Design a protein around this ligand. Structure first.
Ligand code: HEM
Length: 437
């Protein structure tokens, strides 16, 4: 097929804002560094061509940027994530930094640090991220998510992104950091301008906002040194690693990295689930009516959404893969989106199947840098699915969804929907007789 429908033909809604996308088959015509590529193409045939004929692919130089390896198979993606000896994240872990020749947070922030410092940081954070420790946070995810979904169902017409998804990950992360309730709005506005969101003034506002967030975290550090708590900021502030306390910069940058890593990806996954349910209403029905577990459904939403399309590395030494040499210094990119559609691992990979088993998707990565927040990411999706299945009977697209613009992340920033409330469920929620969520 030359083209594909953006909106599946079986969709229950969204048909009035459907558009077709080309399905490119000529590898040479695709520039992976261009964010527009991901919005103007259905890359399904492209990734299949790479997996089957060029599993290690040298993407050419674009502009002043170097070429880079593209790794498309699940087995190879998994194998390369595992190796932080011959590969490093210390020159950046995504295209923008990799192609720039580095990341100024290298050696300090988890995602761009390897060796003893990386293990030391992960080690200091282990207790904080245990399911036992995260129980109060998970409890509050349920309460918060239920409240948002109920309120949205009550109103009918909303933007699922702004009215539900936006208002969950930063609260989760704020709980985790120990950010006071009073500062969460304050923090929310900074985070929004710190990511893009466009021009000169937008780029200027982004770096200013990031700088203000680090300053604020620096203030909380100073408080937690004077008066320790059990939150992540305190843990980082009061820890030592290999005989030394962490520098102010290291603590603040890793606090921030929880927002960087957890906020947008969690939102994108949740937003994706709603669009996907309108596209595959049979799957929605299975979820709503209790015919698949939340656990199984959560994993398939994660595999389907794969919001972080790629992560990358740089070769420390020469390595061989597929009868080819990756040279010391070469950029290497690992495509999770392709891995999560690899038919060699996932039967019928373009089938959205809530009861999919097995489902060892690679949405959270693998190896030493495996997503620090994976348990929380899953809990947010799990809580959303539970809220949707309990308090709504269904929902429809009521306007055109808007894509984010990235060569790294993929998904929606806006999703206009009308939600059909489960009236009986909401009545019991509202009832004055002692049961909420
Ligand atoms: C569905 C949502 C999420 C997705 C798709 C996602 C994806 C990923 C992936 C693929 C990695 C590995 C990066 C690499 O190898 O370079 C990663 C790392 C990381 N994630 Fe997530 N993540 C999610 C949620 C979260 C949340 C909620 C948090 C915060 C609590 C978080 C914090 C981090 C941190 C700090 C790292 C770096 C860990 C390290 O380098 O050792 N993530 N994430």
């Amino acid at each position: 097929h030359h083209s594909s429908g953006l909106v599946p033909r079986g969709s229950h809604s969204g048909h009035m804002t459907a558009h077709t996308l080309p399905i490119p088959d000529d590898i040479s015509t695709i520039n992976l560094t261009d964010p527009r590529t991901y919005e103007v193409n259905d890359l399904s045939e492209y990734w299949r061509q790479l997996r089957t004929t060029r599993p290690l692919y040298w993407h050419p130089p674009v502009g002043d940027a170097p070429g880079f390896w593209v790794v498309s198979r699940y087995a190879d993606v998994m194998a390369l994530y595992k190796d932080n000896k011959k590969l490093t994240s210390e020159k950046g872990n995504v295209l923008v930094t990799l192609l720039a020749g580095g990341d100024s947070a290298a050696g300090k922030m988890l995602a761009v640090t390897d060796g003893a410092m990386h293990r030391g940081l992960r080690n200091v954070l282990l207790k904080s991220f245990s399911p036992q420790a995260l129980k109060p946070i998970v409890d509050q995810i349920r309460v918060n998510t239920t409240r948002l979904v109920v309120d949205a169902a009550r109103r009918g017409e909303c933007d699922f992104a702004a009215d539900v998804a936006e208002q969950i990950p930063l609260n989760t992360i704020s709980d985790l950091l120990g950010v006071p309730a009073a500062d969460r709005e304050f923090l929310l506005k900074l985070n929004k301008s710190a990511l893009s969101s466009e021009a000169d003034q937008s780029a200027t506002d982004a770096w200013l906002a990031r700088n203000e967030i680090l300053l604020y975290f620096s203030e909380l550090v100073a408080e937690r040194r004077a008066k320790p708590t059990e939150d992540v900021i305190s843990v980082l502030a009061n820890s030592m690693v290999d005989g030394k306390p962490l520098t102010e910069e290291v603590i603040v940058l890793n606090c921030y990295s929880l927002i960087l890593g957890g906020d947008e990806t969690s939102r994108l996954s949740m937003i994706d689930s709603v669009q996907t349910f309108t596209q595959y209403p049979d799957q929605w029905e299975l979820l709503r009516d209790g015919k698949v577990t939340l656990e199984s459904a959560t994993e398939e939403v994660l595999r389907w959404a794969t919001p972080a399309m790629h992560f990358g590395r740089r070769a420390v030494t020469d390595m061989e893969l597929h009868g080819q040499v990756i040279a010391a210094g070469d950029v290497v990119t690992l495509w999770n989106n392709s891995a999560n559609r690899d038919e060699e691992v996932f039967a019928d990979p373009y089938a959205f199947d809530l009861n999919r088993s097995p489902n060892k998707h690679i949405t959270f990565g693998y190896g030493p840098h495996f997503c620090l927040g994976a348990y929380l990411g899953r809990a947010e999706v799990h809580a959303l699915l539970d809220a949707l299945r309990t308090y709504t009977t269904g929902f429809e697209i009521t306007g055109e969804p808007q894509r984010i613009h990235s060569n790294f992340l993929t998904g929606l920033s806006r999703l206009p929907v009308r939600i059909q409330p489960n009236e009986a469920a909401i009545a019991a929620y509202d009832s004055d007789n002692g049961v909420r969520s």
